[PDB]
Design a protein around this ligand. Structure first.
Ligand SMILES: CCCCCCCCCCCCCCCCCC(=O)OC[C@H](COP(=O)([O-])OCC(O)COP(=O)([O-])OC[C@@H](COC(=O)CCCCCCCCCCCCCCCCC)OC(=O)CCCCCCCCCCCCCCCCC)OC(=O)CCCCCCCCCCCCCCCCC
Ligand SMILES: CCCCCCCCCCCCCCCCCC(=O)OC[C@H](COP(=O)([O-])OCC(O)COP(=O)([O-])OC[C@@H](COC(=O)CCCCCCCCCCCCCCCCC)OC(=O)CCCCCCCCCCCCCCCCC)OC(=O)CCCCCCCCCCCCCCCCC
Ligand SMILES: CCCCCCCCCCCCCCCCCC(=O)OC[C@H](COP(=O)([O-])OCC[N+](C)(C)C)OC(=O)CCCCCCCCCCCCCCCCC
Ligand SMILES: CCCCCCCCCCCCCCCCCC(=O)OC[C@H](COP(=O)(O)OCCN)OC(=O)CCCCCCCCCCCCCCCCC
Ligand SMILES: CCCCCCCCCCCCCCCCCC(=O)OC[C@H](COP(=O)(O)OCCN)OC(=O)CCCCCCCCCCCCCCCCC
Ligand SMILES: CCCCCCCCCCCCCCCCCC(=O)OC[C@H](COP(=O)(O)OCCN)OC(=O)CCCCCCCCCCCCCCCCC
Ligand SMILES: CCCCCCCCCCCCCCCCCC(=O)OC[C@H](COP(=O)(O)OCCN)OC(=O)CCCCCCCCCCCCCCCCC
Ligand SMILES: CCCCCCCCCCCCCCCCCC(=O)OC[C@H](COP(=O)(O)OCCN)OC(=O)CCCCCCCCCCCCCCCCC
Ligand code: HEC
Ligand code: HEM
Ligand code: HEM
Lengths: 244, 59, 115, 13, 64, 32, 70, 388
């Protein structure tokens, strides 16, 4: 009914990038980009993030160049009007897995795997929702048998979601030897997605702290200035020739 | 007093006052920026980009 | 109409108005803005200069207190006459003159300017 | 406590 | 590669057994019925809400 | 009066140059 | 827009002979008492409908959900 | 005084009008900070204009490029996220400040004579702000943007004889497509300058008839010049507002919005929860509460008719709420009703919210219908409470 329609509510996890002075865990961003490339890029797309966005955030410039040179993209017409494919450079966006929305829906049973660039800002309680969605592939309750071709997921609105349980224990081999479990993989991929949706978070937080402090000092000065200018008026004595 | 001393220094001509205001703005902004940077680096140890173990091992 | 001496609610209302008006040292008639009605303006013109000047002094005192964020001392609050009006009779006379003038074919002696 | 109507000038007027 | 989330939720299962008991009561009622719409997802939601609320901080303090 | 006037004009020029540097910090021009 | 004179006598002191940031702290308890005792009624009329309606809404939602819970 | 040789630059003809109306304008000596709110609304308008110009240096009004252009502003432009967050949250703060402006006016009965023209020009200004913010919110071209545009434009069909024609003409082509996007961009760029003109007329009329004060009394006895006495007060207000607005920009920039506007517009599917921005929610709640959509549009027109009909009341002698206990309570009840009404608009049409909204809108109009009664009784007061 309405409860299943709106989905089981998502808790409030203590994300490492939460707090007025808190930064992304950049090692976790690197790990999340690894897991996204390994398992999530088959169906989902980003299409808003360039390879150059990873330089200085999770990978070094030569590493990003090699990773871009791995894939090949179609480049515009040459001197004969024909089209051709060249290895991706440091400016190309992440590759798209499907030709278009129609091909995506056809490959995924009519359901369109959403673009993941702004996924954590396109859902209410974004980061917690995404983590809970990925981790909470539970056994459906009693007498609610869902149709074939879907999977039960309490957090998803309606309970029935179209993507299968992807994050499995030992799905990927992390570069730095971190033991890959479902929860760890979910944490890393959600950290990566939250960075992707908001790459300016650290600069924004630093600016906010500095300017709130500075403007607080300005507010004290402005209050003193106003009191000083008004003190010849507020501490004045007037005689008016009237009683009642 | 220190206030009277600094007044007799930099509060007799307006040009010197405006130059002092600009210099103080620059210096104070730099000082606050350094302090906030130190605070941020202290609070987020380990999470920086420069100190991840596999920064140059993909090659 | 059962306002005075027979309505508990009206007695409470009068008590509150007395409290507030004496607190700022005003009178009820002083709340009548000349710019509001243009009949208060004529009444104030017709009133004696001593009464008008006392009204202006009370208004200035009230505005001063409102600026300073304080009230009259308890002594002057005690020596207050919030409802010793001075304007109602002249205002009623002016309104009655206006009533007859409009009743039998007359131009208004003054009109509000279009702002 | 408040003065009578005659113990002023504006009040008398 | 034992799942920290599964282990932690199993550990905190006996913390708020009351929603679980309510859910089991509905399970018994539904088994007796065996013919209606018979979902009662509300008990499911309450029980898993409690478990999720429990496993909030422990998961990340256990994760790398 | 002229010495005082030119002194004040030079002081205002120094203030203007300081404001200009503050607005556009140019170590590229400062170094040489 | 004329100005009406009042025939007063006003004494005022220069701003540099007065304490400028002490009147805010002189009488905090008395000022808090005055605020509360003067605006408790208005606070009730503001926050009353809101809290009452909120309690009613959560109560009715609880009843409805529990009733529809099979 | 014969002005043979010039004394002061401020009294020279180049700065004479500015001198009068900015430095030398006499002001009541007892003004509180809500007059600062009026000045603050002016500053918010200027901020919106500047950030909007610099944003429009990067926004493409095409349906295939608007969303990605905004993401361009956020990711590629040097300090572009600051510009966009400033524009959006500045729209929000503009509406917050204007609401506080309006409610101070209601509390102190500043709409009364002789400021009827000031209040009416304010109502026109509020209409212009509503239209500008709506057409601007259509610009980013998300799910909420497209669907809110669809709904709010399609409720214009409630006009009896020419509703459908107006809807189709405003849509430009049977839907809310590219033609509507270009149309809305041009109108959103144009309207703020008419808003500036309306604000200038607002201020001119007020300056004609002085300014009210917390007492509501005549205030030509104790008046002081605007500068520096109220410039410093307004400055304190501005700095506090800057701290508030900086809290919103840098730490919680997406709280005042909905997450559905980050999904590209897809006219095929429909998001489950279509609501306007938070500052249109009271109006949306009134309109949704009264069914029979023709009745809803008539009810919105009635809201604006009541707002325009406040100044032209009969007796209303005592002005301020400090000496009107009954009206003070009525005003606080109205404010609570407005907040509740705004909260109702974000809720679904399922019960009990229909009943709550149908009561709240009725109470709103009830406030607007019981002020003259209080005025008449108050006009009756003085000849009953006499102490002799
Ligand atoms: C709800 C809780 C209510 C608690 C009330 C407590 C109380 O007694 O308050 C009244 C009491 C004074 O009562 P009052 O004389 O009627 O009010 C002052 C006048 O308004 C005259 O004010 P002033 O000019 O003398 O003081 C200037 C300044 C003094 O304040 C400061 O200097 C900093 C205040 C920081 C507050 C956080 O600000 C204030 O006093 C408050 C007004 C601030 C401006 C607000 C303008 C609108 C902003 C809109 C933004 C957009 C939305 O004020 C305080 O207690 C505040 C100061 C407390 C100690 C800190 C002093 C720091 C130096
Ligand atoms: C006047 C100033 C009004 C400021 C209103 C700020 C605002 O819109 O906040 C809602 C805004 C909506 O975000 P959200 O509710 O988290 O997400 C929406 C979801 O659908 C989740 O929504 P939800 O179902 O949880 O609750 C929705 C609820 C938000 O829930 C709450 O606010 C809960 C309490 C906090 O939305 C509202 O209450 C929106 C209406 C409130 C403003 C109505 C203003 C009416 C002014 C007078 C109108 C007069 C018309 C005629 C004029 C002539 O932000 C918040 O609720 C959180 C921040 C609140 C900050 C309050 C203090 C700073 C202001
Ligand atoms: C740096 C931050 C300083 C914060 C000071 C807070 C108040 C300290 C107590 C005090 O002396 O208050 C009275 C003073 C004012 O002095 P005063 O004249 O009101 O009081 C004199 C009487 N005695 C000394 C007994 C208190 O308050 C302030 O100076 C308010 C802060 C204004 C300065 C802001 C600087 C911003 C710089 C960027
Ligand atoms: C609008 C802004 C103000 C415009 C002023 C000029 C208007 C048109 C000319 C008016 C007539 C005139 O000559 O005015 C100048 C005025 C004359 O003085 P007056 O008070 O009339 O009488 C004394 C007789 N000599 O003389 C004065 O009032 C003296 C002003 C002297 C200012 C010189 C210092 C300027 C320094 C550079 C700018 C600030 C530097 C810091 C910032 C740098 C940039 C970031
Ligand atoms: C007014 C136009 C100002 C134009 C200007 O100053 O542009 C900045 C330009 C480059 O300076 P910038 O890039 O800041 O320095 C490189 C490393 N210090 O600046 C320069 O190339 C030199 C600027 C010198 C000062 C110019 C003042 C006018
Ligand atoms: C930048 C925006 C500046 C806006 C300034 C205010 C709006 C323009 C007002 C123009 C105007 O009507 O000025 C009247 C004045 C006529 O001269 P005067 O006889 O002194 O009139 C005093 C009024 N009775 O007109 C004049 O004397 C000429 C004024 C020219 C406009 C100067 C504006 C400031 C420029 C810096
Ligand atoms: C939250 C929304 C706030 C909206 C405010 C709109 C304007 C209301 C206003 O002007 O309130 C001021 C009023 C002060 O009363 P006044 O007679 O003006 O001043 C006497 C000074 N001792 O204030 C009062 O009389 C009471 C103010 C507080 C009421 C609510 C308290 C809980 C919040
Ligand atoms: C279920 C369906 C029916 C629902 C409604 C039924 C109830 C209707 C109202 C019943 C109560 C009416 C009371 C009217 C008499 C008030 C008397 C009064 O003014 O008392 C004085 C008191 C002064 O306050 P204060 O100064 O703090 O007191 C200290 C004194 N030394 O003053 C005060 O305390 C001020 C009190 C102001 C109250 C204003 C609101 C109530 C009266 C009008 C109701 C209008 C309802 C419709 C409109 C609502 C708003 C939109
Ligand atoms: C192909 C199979 C995959 C793979 C490998 C992943 N996803 Fe998922 N995903 C897929 C589909 C077909 C859908 C659509 C379901 C529907 O909306 O009906 C989704 C959906 C999502 C969502 C959206 C959920 C919501 O909007 O409530 C998210 C956030 C999501 N997918 C994330 C995600 C991640 C992080 C993946 C890597 C582990 C991933 N998907 C893999 C199809 C597929
Ligand atoms: C663009 C938004 C607005 C701006 C910039 C604006 C600007 C101003 C300014 C500068 C003043 C004079 C200073 C002051 O008293 O605060 C003022 C006063 C006033 N405004 Fe507005 N205003 C705006 C919106 C409104 C609205 C929507 C209304 C109501 C419909 C309104 C009604 C009033 C009233 C009644 C006054 C008289 C002030 C008094 O009585 O003391 N204003 N406004
Ligand atoms: C002439 C001045 C203005 C210009 C040129 C302008 C231009 C723009 C542009 C280009 C956008 C889209 C950019 C974006 O998506 O962030 C936008 C968005 C918006 N504008 Fe304006 N604007 C102006 C003034 C205003 C004013 C006065 C308001 C009213 C408060 C307003 C309200 C909005 C809103 C609500 C949005 C959508 C916010 C969002 O992107 O989510 N604008 N404006």
């Amino acid at each position: 009914a309405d409860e299943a329609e709106h989905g089981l509510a998502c808790p409030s996890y203590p994300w490492p990038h939460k707090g007025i002075l808190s930064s992304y865990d950049h090692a976790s961003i690197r790990r999340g980009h690894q897991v996204y490339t390994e398992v999530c890029a088959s169906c989902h797309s980003m299409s808003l993030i360039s390879y150059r966005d990873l330089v200085g955030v999770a990978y070094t410039e030569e590493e990003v160049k090699a990773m871009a040179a791995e894939i090949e993209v179609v480049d515009g017409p040459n001197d004969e009007g024909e089209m051709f494919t060249r290895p991706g450079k440091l400016s190309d966006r992440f590759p798209q897995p499907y030709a278009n929305e129609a091909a995506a829906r056809f490959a995924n049973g009519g359901a369109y795997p959403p673009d993941l660039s702004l996924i954590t800002k396109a859902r209410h309680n974004g980061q917690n929702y995404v983590f809970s969605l990925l981790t909470g592939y539970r056994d459906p309750p009693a007498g609610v048998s869902i149709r074939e071709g879907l999977h039960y997921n309490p957090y998803f609105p309606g309970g029935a979601i179209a993507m299968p349980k992807m994050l499995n224990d030992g799905a990927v081999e992390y570069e730095d030897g971190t033991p890959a479990t479902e929860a760890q993989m979910g944490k890393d991929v959600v950290s990566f997605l939250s960075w992707a949706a908001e790459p300016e978070m650290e600069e924004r937080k630093l600016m906010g702290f500095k300017w709130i402090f500075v403007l607080s000092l300005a507010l004290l000065q402005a209050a003193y200035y106003r009191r000083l200018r008004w003190s010849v008026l507020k501490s004045r004595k007037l005689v008016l020739d009237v009683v009642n | 007093g220190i206030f009277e001393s600094l007044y007799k220094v930099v509060m007799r001509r307006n040009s010197v006052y405006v130059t002092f205001v600009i210099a103080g703005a620059f210096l104070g902004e730099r000082a606050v920026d350094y302090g906030i940077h130190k605070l941020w680096e202290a609070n987020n140890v380990g999470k920086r980009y420069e100190d991840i173990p596999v920064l140059g091992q993909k090659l | 109409f059962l306002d005075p001496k027979k309505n508990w609610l009206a007695a409470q209302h009068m008590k509150s108005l007395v409290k507030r008006l004496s607190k700022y040292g005003l009178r009820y008639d002083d709340l009548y803005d000349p710019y509001y009605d243009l009949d208060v303006k004529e009444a104030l013109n017709r009133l004696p200069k001593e009464v008008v000047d006392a009204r202006h002094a009370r208004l200035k005192r009230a505005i001063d207190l409102s600026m300073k964020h304080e009230y009259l001392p308890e002594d002057l609050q005690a020596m207050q006459t919030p409802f010793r009006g001075y304007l109602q009779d002249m205002l009623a006379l002016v309104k009655r003159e206006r009533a007859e003038r409009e009743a039998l074919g007359g131009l208004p002696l003054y009109q509000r300017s279009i702002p | 406590a408040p003065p009578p109507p005659t113990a002023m000038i504006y009040d008398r007027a | 590669p034992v799942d920290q989330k599964r282990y932690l939720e199993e550990s905190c299962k006996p913390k708020c057994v009351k929603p679980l008991l309510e859910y089991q009561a509905c399970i018994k009622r539904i088994h007796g019925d065996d013919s209606g719409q018979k979902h009662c997802t509300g008990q499911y939601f309450d029980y898993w809400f409690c478990v999720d609320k429990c496993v909030a901080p422990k998961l990340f303090t256990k994760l790398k | 009066i002229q010495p005082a006037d030119v002194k004040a004009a030079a002081m205002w020029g120094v203030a203007a140059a300081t404001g200009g540097l503050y607005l556009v910090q140019v170590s590229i021009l400062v170094l040489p | 827009k004329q100005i009406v004179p009042v025939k007063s006598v006003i004494y005022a002191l220069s701003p540099f002979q007065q304490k400028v940031m002490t009147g805010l702290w002189k009488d905090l308890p008395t000022k808090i008492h005055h605020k509360v005792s003067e605006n408790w009624i208005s606070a009730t009329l503001l926050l009353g409908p809101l809290v009452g309606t909120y309690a009613y809404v959560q109560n009715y939602l609880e009843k409805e959900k529990l009733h529809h819970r099979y | 005084t014969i002005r043979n040789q010039r004394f002061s630059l401020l009294k020279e003809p180049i700065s004479s009008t500015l001198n009068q109306h900015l430095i030398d304008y006499p002001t009541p000596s007892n003004l509180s900070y809500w007059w600062g709110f009026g000045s603050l609304a002016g500053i918010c308008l200027v901020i919106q204009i500047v950030t909007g110009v610099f944003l429009a240096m990067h926004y493409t009004p095409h349906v295939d490029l608007a969303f990605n252009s905004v993401e361009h502003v956020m990711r590629d432009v040097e300090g572009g996220w600051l510009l966009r967050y400033m524009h959006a949250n500045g729209a929000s703060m503009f509406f917050i400040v204007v609401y506080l402006h309006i409610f101070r006016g209601l509390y102190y009965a500043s709409y009364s004579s002789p400021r009827e023209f000031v209040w009416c020009l304010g109502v026109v200004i509020f209409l212009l702000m509503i239209v500008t913010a709506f057409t601007g919110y259509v610009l980013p071209w998300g799910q909420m943007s497209f669907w809110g545009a669809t709904v709010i434009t399609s409720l214009a069909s409630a006009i009896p004889v020419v509703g459908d024609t107006i809807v189709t003409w405003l849509w430009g082509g049977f839907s809310v497509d590219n033609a509507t996007l270009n149309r809305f961009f041009s109108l959103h760029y144009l309207l703020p300058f008419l808003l500036v003109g309306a604000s200038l007329l607002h201020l001119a009329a007020l300056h004609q008839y002085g300014s009210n004060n917390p007492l509501g009394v005549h205030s030509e006895m104790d008046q002081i010049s605007f500068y520096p006495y109220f410039y410093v007060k307004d400055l304190v207000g501005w700095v506090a507002f800057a701290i508030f607005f900086s809290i919103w920009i840098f730490y919680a920039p997406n709280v005042l919005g909905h997450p559905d506007n980050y999904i590209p517009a897809n006219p095929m599917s429909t998001p489950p929860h279509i609501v306007p921005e938070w500052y249109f929610l009271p109006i949306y709640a009134i309109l949704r509460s009264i069914p029979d959509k023709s009745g809803g549009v008539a009810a919105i027109a009635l809201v604006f008719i009541c707002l325009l009909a406040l100044p032209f009341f009969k007796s209303m002698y005592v002005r301020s709420s400090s000496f009107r206990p009954i009206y003070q309570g009525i005003f606080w009840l109205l404010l609570a009703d407005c907040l509740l009404l705004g909260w109702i608009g974000c809720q679904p049409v399922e019960a009990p919210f229909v009943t709550i909204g149908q009561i709240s809108s009725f109470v709103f109009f009830l406030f607007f219908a019981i002020t003259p009664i209080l005025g008449r009784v108050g006009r009756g007061i003085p000849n009953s409470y006499t102490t002799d």
